[PDB]
Amino acid sequence: SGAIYVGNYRVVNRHLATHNDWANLVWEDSSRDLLVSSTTAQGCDTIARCDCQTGVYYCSSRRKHYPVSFSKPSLIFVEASEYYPARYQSHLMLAVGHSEPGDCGGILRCQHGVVGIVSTGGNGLVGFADVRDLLWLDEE
Ligand SMILES: CNS(=O)(=O)c1cccc(C)c1F
Ligand SMILES: [Zn+2]
Q1: Nearest CA among 67, 63, 59, 62 for reference residue 118
Q2: Which of 37, 87, 114, 118 has its CA 20 to 30 A from that of 127?
Q3: Where in the sequence is the active site?
């Protein structure tokens, strides 16, 4: 579990969005595993605007933050998980590291701020759903 809280937006994995998220929907994309809902209180996070490929992610299934190198946002085919079939997922970055289903929503951060959230796992890789191209997250 986990979310990004930027301005009056809550960014979650689409597969973990709640009824309240869907009832207060701003934007969702299944191909990207992302959903954004509206918030009453303003949030503590800053979104990275950059092409970094080094950063740090939180792994709940280790209670640990790991430094990683990651691929740029890409169209990947993802093997079946507990929450999704084997399918192509867009705007996905891969790193070598530990990810189980409950790790989804962990933040990946670089020197410029939040890069994305854990979205895929397995075979010793961790995938992150990029959010850095979402420029409207920064206004309105
Ligand atoms: C098919 N590629 S993608 O994974 O959807 C993607 C990644 C990065 C930037 C863009 C605009 C994009 F289309
Ligand atoms: Zn950066």
Answers
A1: 59
A2: 37
A3: 15, 33, 104
CA distance 31 to 9: 20
Q: Residue of the nearest CA to atom 12 in ligand 1?
A: 91
Count of other CB atoms within 10 angstroms of residue 86: 9
Residue among 71, 60, 74, 73 nearest 107 (CA):
60
Task: Work out which ligand 1 atom sits closest to the CA atom of 75.
Answer: 4
| Resolution of the experimental model, in Å, one decimal | 1.4
Q: What is the distance between the alpha carbons of residues 80 and 29, in angstroms, rounded to a whole number? A: 19
CA Rg value for the chain: 14
Q: For the chain, what are the domain ranges?
A: 3-44, 45-140
Q: How was this structure determined?
A: X-ray
**Which residues lie with the beta carbon below 6 Å from any ligand 1 atom?**
73-75, 90-91
| 65 carries an active-site annotation | no
